[PDB]
Amino acid sequence: ARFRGSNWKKSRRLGISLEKRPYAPGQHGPNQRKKLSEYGLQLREKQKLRYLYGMTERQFRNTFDIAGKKFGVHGENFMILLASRLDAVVYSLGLARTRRQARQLVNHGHILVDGKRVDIPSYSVKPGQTISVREKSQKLNIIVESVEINNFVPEYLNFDADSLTGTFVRLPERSELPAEINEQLIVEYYSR
Amino acid sequence: PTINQLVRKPRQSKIKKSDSPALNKGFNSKKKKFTDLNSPQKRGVCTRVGTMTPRKPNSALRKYARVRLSNNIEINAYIPGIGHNLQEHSVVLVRGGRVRDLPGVRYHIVRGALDTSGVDGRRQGRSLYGTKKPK
Amino acid sequence: RREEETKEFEERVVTINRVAKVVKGGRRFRFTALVVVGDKNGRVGFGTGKAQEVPEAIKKAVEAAKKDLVVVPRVEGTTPHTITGRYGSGSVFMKPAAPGTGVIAGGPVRAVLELAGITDILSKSLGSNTPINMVRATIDGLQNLKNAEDVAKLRGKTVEELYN
Amino acid sequence: TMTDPIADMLTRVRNANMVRHEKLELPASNIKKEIAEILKSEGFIKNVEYVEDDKQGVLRLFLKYGQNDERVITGLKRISKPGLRVYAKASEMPKVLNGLGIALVSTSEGVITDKEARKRNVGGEIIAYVW
Amino acid sequence: SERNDRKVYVGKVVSDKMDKTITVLVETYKTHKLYGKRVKYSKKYKTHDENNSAKLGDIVKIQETRPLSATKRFRLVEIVEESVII
Amino acid sequence: AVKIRLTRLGSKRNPFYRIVVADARSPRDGRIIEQIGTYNPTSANAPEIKVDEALALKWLNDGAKPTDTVHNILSKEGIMKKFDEQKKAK
RNA sequence: UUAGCUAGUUGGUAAGGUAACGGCUUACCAAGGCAACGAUGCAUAGCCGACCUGAGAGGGUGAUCGGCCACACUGGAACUG
RNA sequence: CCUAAUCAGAAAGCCACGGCUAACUACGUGCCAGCAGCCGCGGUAAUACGUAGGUGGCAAGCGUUAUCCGGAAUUAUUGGGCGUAAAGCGCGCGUAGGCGGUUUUUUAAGUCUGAUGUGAAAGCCCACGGCUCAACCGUGGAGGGUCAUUGGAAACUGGAAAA
């Protein structure tokens, strides 16, 4: 159950962007609903980080606690890890219009991480790595459609747009990653 | 207490007790002793199906049944769900769990595993009470 | 003592009870509610009050909250050291933490510490589970908490020879 | 019969804190003089003055108090008490209150504060925390 | 072979009422896993004399020798202190 | 009755044998005495193999019968050359 | 709410026997030995590296995997080696 | 395993929605049927029974049951108490035991400290490498003794001797 939902109703709940948005989903949606307790705030933050990349919880906890291994602060490490996934590297660099397009691009295998075939969106990208587009498939309608627009480029990731080659450079952070979030609540959620 | 007074006694605990006092099953056959075999559930032949009522403040004709188990013990267990496809001499699988209706019954059978067939009168709690997904 | 509405503030309610006074004939009730008040930058205070309605009672609690105030000795987004709070069997225990951990505690004491501007801190409630006593014990622990400069002035020696 | 003199001195010190009196009187001892000297060297004791009369002691110490009459410590107690004696290695030696407080510890070479005891990589039997 | 300085255990005598054999009471004190305090529990090592040389109440040390009889192993090496009623 | 032999340790498809001294009565994957080296049939042609070649000479000089498999690797290494240079010299 | 247990037991001598020391077994002499710091009995149980849990001290378990032990329808015995 | 070709067409559900605990509306029912881990619902307008819609959690898994730990500081050495809440026996004499006034000298058993051997390997942790990644495996490291031997210290505990 990686992704087969509308993914808008959830964003309607969370108030986040990857007419109808002022309301709440469902019949009892648009009118007054319950308040938010601390547990609800923490769950909301968890979902607001998880549905962003479309991965699952049994993977979420593992990704969370493999970020608990290295030194430094905990949250920042968690986000620099979860934005170090393959789909984050593909989309946040500008090879798509949303996060799920990257998932279908990687599971298809259109990308060539280190110029090699890979069939998982969960691989961990690393510095000193490049990424290609399986040059045989560098000219489909969707790919060249998405690349032309200079949507955005952070300074820890590069481009040669005509060559369609991205590459990791430096460890990112919340300062270089858009869609900024709260770290204390989400780490506190996995305490109790 | 003082440290030496604590050395010369092992700091005894308040060891708990079981909630399913027939979680245990005695030696089946070829023996007279009772084994400590543990199980999450036991089968059994029901020698009578009856019905009783709880104490105050609840009021309802609650349906129960006494069952002879594999370990040749005698317990009581109420049948949940709508409708019961049991009677005397009916074998049945049994779970564990207490009900506050009245003591002398602290189990409840499982619906759909044994002779006790699942009731298809439900569509929401189907994975319990033996109901299968309808189409 | 010396309430101020000049700084920024963040009202935060801990609990509400329906509390009753029995008389001949009917049965009179009067809602109650406790609150904690702080600017989450190093200043905090709790509050209590009672009224026949929710908003008036919580307003009373808040207006009485600013009148009792706490200096909150803080350092590096954490408490300077570890302590144990004790007030009327409502014991409580706090301990500093490496950055990135976050406040972990009970609901009321989480609200107390989140609203006093502490980011990363370790603690666990003990003894009684009623919010009021453990919150008051938490504040008592913050009252008898000291920092390096608060002690280095007292002792004849200085900081940089004794430091966390 | 008195089971422990260190317990007596620390109870005298704390009971002097609760009422605040500059002067106190207590039968001295070599370990008592040394720990009093270290107390003065931390900064908690204003002055030290040993006296002699038949036979031991009696160690008279001058307390310390802040300008607003504020007690310097927030607690004081021992760790090594009879029946359950305790010891502490050099690395395992505890940092009570870190720099804030100190940890009096008796070593093969003498009694010193917690710091020097971890610097020299020689531990010993702790006696009392203070903070 | 010569590699062991045999396990020398001091102790005292408890009885002498058997031929060429005594019952040395070795004494030590050992800790507790749960707490960290010390307490002494005794043992009674039987020992092989030559001519019942040791006395009752003596202080002596012993050493590993070999299995000599039914539950008696150690031999004496040197009597430490011998005296009369104190 | 002690011989150089291998103890496989890999999981399902990439086995990882170990070079180690052992008695023939012991299980292949049971107890051992002292480890020397290891073995790996995968990831490289020629494979990657390590060897003590300092205390391994001790066990060959005081007695052991390495299998012909071990003969292959040690002859490729040439320490068994020094072993026979020590033996057949006199 | 398991308080006395032990008579080859404990010690010696001699011999035999065992790869070996040894009441290991014999005959003689002696009455000691074990036990509140828990003998003996009863009941259960193979043990361990570890596994699970816990912040930590601890608590529970002995499935795979490796080490040691005990056993091969039940009881007794011995040849080979 | 790879090449090339073809189709979104074969591939998704389970629990819960009064509080705890994130998630409400209608109808049926009306102390009946039933729910129930607890507090507890239902005798005619049930957000708690059943059903429908909607929603939340989770997922090729999900819920129940049994068992164990945590929570449980509810065996409390770290980390509990004994006026009234369970807990000071009726008290006395006293063995074994536990504990120990002040100072000096001395021993170095405890203690502290260094080395040596050892605590198999696998495992836990750390770092790296290899199976497309992860799982896993390997490598190496640290860690692990209430461990033994031995070189030093003597404040403290202990042994001896002297005030």
Swiss-Prot record, chain C:
Which Gene3D superfamilies does the annotation name? 3.30.160.20, 3.30.230.10
InterPro entries reported for this sequence: Ribosomal_Su5_D2-typ_SF, Ribosomal_uS5, Ribosomal_uS5_bac-type, Ribosomal_uS5_C, Ribosomal_uS5_N, Ribosomal_uS5_N_CS, Ribsml_uS5_D2-typ_fold_subgr
Q: Does the keyword Repeat apply?
A: no
Q: What biological process terms from GO does the record include? A: translation
Record GO cellular component, one term: cytosolic small ribosomal subunit
Note the Pfam families from the entry.
Ribosomal_S5, Ribosomal_S5_C
Note whether Nucleotide-binding occurs among the keywords: no
Positions of the S5 DRBM domain: 9-72
**Key words of the record:** Ribonucleoprotein, Ribosomal protein, RNA-binding, rRNA-binding
One example of the protein's molecular function in GO is: rRNA binding
Question: NCBIfam families, from UniProt?
Answer: rpsE_bact (TIGR01021)
- Family listed: Belongs to the universal ribosomal protein uS5 family.
Protein role: With S4 and S12 plays an important role in translational accuracy. Located at the back of the 30S subunit body where it stabilizes the conformation of the head with respect to the body.
- How would you summarize the oligomeric state and partners of this protein? Part of the 30S ribosomal subunit. Contacts proteins S4 and S8.
What note about domains is in the entry?
The N-terminal domain interacts with the head of the 30S subunit; the C-terminal domain interacts with the body and contacts protein S4. The interaction surface between S4 and S5 is involved in control of translational fidelity.
| Record protein name field | Small ribosomal subunit protein uS5
Which lineage? Bacteria, Bacillati, Bacillota, Bacilli, Bacillales
UniProtKB/Swiss-Prot annotation, chain D:
GO terms assigned for molecular function? rRNA binding; structural constituent of ribosome
Can you list the disulfide-bonded cysteine pairs? Answer: none
Q: Which UniProt keywords apply?
A: Ribonucleoprotein, Ribosomal protein, RNA-binding, rRNA-binding
Q: Which domain of life is it from?
A: Bacteria
Q: Which InterPro entries match?
A: Ribosomal_uS8 (IPR000630), Ribosomal_uS8_CS (IPR047863), Ribosomal_uS8_sf (IPR035987)
Which Pfam families did the record assign? Answer: Ribosomal_S8 (PF00410)
Cellular component GO terms, alphabetical: cytosolic small ribosomal subunit
Its GO biological process terms? translation
PANTHER family given for it?
40S RIBOSOMAL PROTEIN S15A
Please give the subunit comment from the record: Part of the 30S ribosomal subunit. Contacts proteins S5 and S12.
* Family stated for the protein in its record: Belongs to the universal ribosomal protein uS8 family.
Function text: One of the primary rRNA binding proteins, it binds directly to 16S rRNA central domain where it helps coordinate assembly of the platform of the 30S subunit.
Q: What is this protein called?
A: Small ribosomal subunit protein uS8
Kindly list the organism's lineage.
Answer: Bacteria, Bacillati, Bacillota, Bacilli, Bacillales
Gene encoding the protein: rpsH
Swiss-Prot record, chain E:
InterPro entries per record:
NA-bd_OB-fold, Ribosomal_uS17, Ribosomal_uS17_bact/chlr, Ribosomal_uS17_CS
Biological processes annotated in GO: translation
Q: Does the keyword Glycoprotein apply?
A: no
Keywords linked to the UniProt accession: Ribonucleoprotein, Ribosomal protein, RNA-binding, rRNA-binding
Molecular function (GO) terms for this protein are: rRNA binding; structural constituent of ribosome
Q: Which PROSITE patterns match?
A: RIBOSOMAL_S17 (PS00056)
What the entry lists under CDD domains is as follows:
Ribosomal_uS17
- Any keyword Ribonucleoprotein? yes
**What interactions and quaternary structure are annotated?**
Part of the 30S ribosomal subunit.
This chain's function reads: One of the primary rRNA binding proteins, it binds specifically to the 5'-end of 16S ribosomal RNA.
Indicate the family of this protein: Belongs to the universal ribosomal protein uS17 family.
Protein name listed in UniProt = Small ribosomal subunit protein uS17
Its lineage reads: Bacteria, Bacillati, Bacillota, Bacilli, Bacillales
From Swiss-Prot, chain F:
User: Does the keyword Membrane feature in the UniProt annotation?
Assistant: no
A cellular component annotation (GO) from this entry = small ribosomal subunit
Please provide the Gene Ontology terms (biological process) for this protein: translation
From the UniProt record, which GO molecular function terms apply?
A: structural constituent of ribosome
The organism's place on the tree of life at top rank: Bacteria
Record flagged with keyword Disulfide bond: no
Q: Which Pfam families match?
A: Ribosomal_S16
Keywords of the record, alphabetical order, are:
Ribonucleoprotein, Ribosomal protein
Q: Which family does it belong to?
A: Belongs to the bacterial ribosomal protein bS16 family.
Q: Which NCBIfam families match?
A: S16
Task: List the protein's name.
Answer: Small ribosomal subunit protein bS16
Q: Lineage from the top down?
A: Bacteria, Bacillati, Bacillota, Bacilli, Bacillales
